[PDB]
């Protein structure tokens, strides 16, 4: 409905699509996993690093959609391609709905969803049984299965915490990575998989 010249929404929608195809294609699942892992290690608060990491997976993006990395460097006027890939008209940090934070969060949700698809009934039930904080810590327990969610490897991922109970339960408060809403949707997926 809007008028935004940058590719922010494109990459979001492209990742949505690539994930549907990956439910069959194993080689694509592993390629997409790597891509998403690379986005998640990157700091969304650092616009330069974040443009660079999306930029360096150009082979992968071209396979799906050549329009994602398209830049029509016509004549000697307008921006350069080097300069374009470091700029807002490629991917802008102050986007009102798909800024780099939102894409980083989206990539986290997609990474868990990607590994959930082929995971066993016990795993899906663990997703359902746990509250959001227990769930985040459970995802960390399954690494790399549901992604490499751990300090260092996913940016903004917090140190594990322990409930004041006998015995303690592991919990994780990384709402900036996997929001309570993301977990709710992860749960919805786990349910759908148990109904297949």
């Amino acid at each position: 409905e809007y008028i935004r010249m940058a590719k922010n929404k494109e990459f979001f929608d492209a990742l949505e699509e690539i994930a549907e195809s990956a439910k069959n294609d194993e080689t694509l699942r592993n390629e997409l996993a790597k891509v998403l892992d690379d986005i998640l290690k990157t700091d969304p608060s650092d616009p330069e690093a974040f443009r660079k990491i999306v930029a360096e997976h150009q082979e992968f993006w071209d396979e799906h959609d050549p329009s994602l990395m398209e830049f029509n460097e016509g004549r000697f006027f307008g921006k350069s391609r080097k300069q374009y890939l470091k700029s807002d008209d490629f991917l802008n940090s102050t986007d009102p709905t798909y800024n780099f934070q939102k894409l980083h969060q989206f990539a986290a949700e997609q990474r868990v969803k990607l590994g959930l698809e082929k995971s066993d009934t016990d795993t899906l039930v663990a997703i359902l049984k746990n509250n959001p904080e227990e769930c985040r810590a459970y995802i960390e327990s399954k690494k790399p299965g549901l992604g490499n969610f751990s300090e260092g490897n996913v940016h903004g991922w917090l140190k594990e915490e322990y409930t004041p109970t006998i015995p303690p339960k592991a919990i994780n408060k990384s709402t900036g990575v996997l929001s309570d809403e993301a977990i709710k949707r992860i749960k919805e997926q786990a349910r759908d998989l148990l109904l297949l």
């Binding site: 594990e160 915490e161 322990y162 004041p164 006998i166 015995p167 303690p168």
Partner: protein, 185 residues
Amino acid sequence: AGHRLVLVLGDLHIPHRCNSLPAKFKKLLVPGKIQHILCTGNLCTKESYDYLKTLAGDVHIVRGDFDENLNYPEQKVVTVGQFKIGLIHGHQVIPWGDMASLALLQRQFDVDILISGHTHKFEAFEHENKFYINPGSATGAYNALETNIIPSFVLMDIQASTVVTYVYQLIGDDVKVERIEYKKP
């Protein structure tokens, strides 16, 4: 499955320094989970002892310098899983909590883990391949040098060659838990 939960606490000093455990510790210390309780002493009376028995059947305790019960032993050595664990109140060591003294006692008892009290200051650390625990005071009772003490205790989760030590401390409005891990070399 395979794990054993050991509550480690002491220096309650009930009733002469505190009337009770903090409401938040009471609430969380439920029966039917803990297998063994190792108490560093100075519960002070039978009332506290009978409370510990509500939490677990197997209660081990050593004599603190204010304990009413003269039947408790000075020290105790107890084997849990693969770990030999020594227990002593710690007023016997001078200066209090001294590392050279605690080290000597570890070697004297021949224990993998040495639990002691008396300082009202929680400890958990590896020193020279051996492990040392002080649960602090579960009531936050004043010691000889200080009031304004943080109530605390420890739960050990023992499995195989490994002991996971959880320290519970009441700080402001929350019980904060820390996790330290120790493997037998």
